[PDB]
Amino acid sequence: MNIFEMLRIDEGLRLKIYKDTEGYYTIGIGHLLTKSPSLNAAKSELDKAIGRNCNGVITKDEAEKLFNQDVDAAVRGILRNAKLKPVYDSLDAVRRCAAINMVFQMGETGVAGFTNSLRMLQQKRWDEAAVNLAKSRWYNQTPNRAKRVITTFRTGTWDAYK
Ligand SMILES: CCCc1ccccc1
Numbered sequence: 001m002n003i004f005e006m007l008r009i010d011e012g013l014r015l016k017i018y019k020d021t022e023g024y025y026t027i028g029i030g031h032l033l034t035k036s037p038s039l040n041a042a043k044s045e046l047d048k049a050i051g052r053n054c055n056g057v058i059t060k061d062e063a064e065k066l067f068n069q070d071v072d073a074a075v076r077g078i079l080r081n082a083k084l085k086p087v088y089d090s091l092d093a094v095r096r097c098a099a100i101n102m103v104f105q106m107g108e109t110g111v112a113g114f115t116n117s118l119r120m121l122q123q124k125r126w127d128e129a130a131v132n133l134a135k136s137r138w139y140n141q142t143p144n145r146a147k148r149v150i151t152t153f154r155t156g157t158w159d160a161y162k
């Protein structure tokens with residue numbers, strides 16, 4: 001497994017504009033278009049992102065290109081953030097994927113506020129980190145996905161995704 005296979009499981013693939021778990025217009029593999037309630041605003045953001053008039057529909061190739069850009073952006077957000085980078089650099093390769101997954105879902109700023117969990121992860125206190133990560137709006141709103149990510153941090157294996 002790798003980060004692309006992991007996020008494809010967590011996000012799915014839809015080729016027409018849809019609403020995410022929070023009600024926001026989204027397309028592809030979890031690509032957020034806008035938080036505005038206007039479908040026309042979402043369609044405008046989509047055309048700008050793809051470079052053509054899409055009328056709310058994209059191809060699989062276009063979805064996978066947005067996905068590559070979004071994963072790259074998540075990694076760069078980690079590497080430029082003074083709170084996230086040292087923790088990320090301390091992790092093994094499997095747990096790094098769990099970190100990228102959280103930033104992809106919630107953004108660099110949201111994850112950087114998980115101050116106590118970040119310290120526990122840097123100290124390699126896996127069970128303690130797992131308990132702390134579950135005490136969150138994130139876990140309560142998307143519990144099945146959060147459980148998979150937390151299990152990945154707890155064990156350093158892909159068992160939750162197999
Ligand atoms: C609970 C924080 C997960 C994380 C995210 C980015 C980099 C390191 C750790």
Ligand SMILES: [Cl-]
Pocket residue numbers: 141142143144145146
């Ligand atoms: Cl879920």
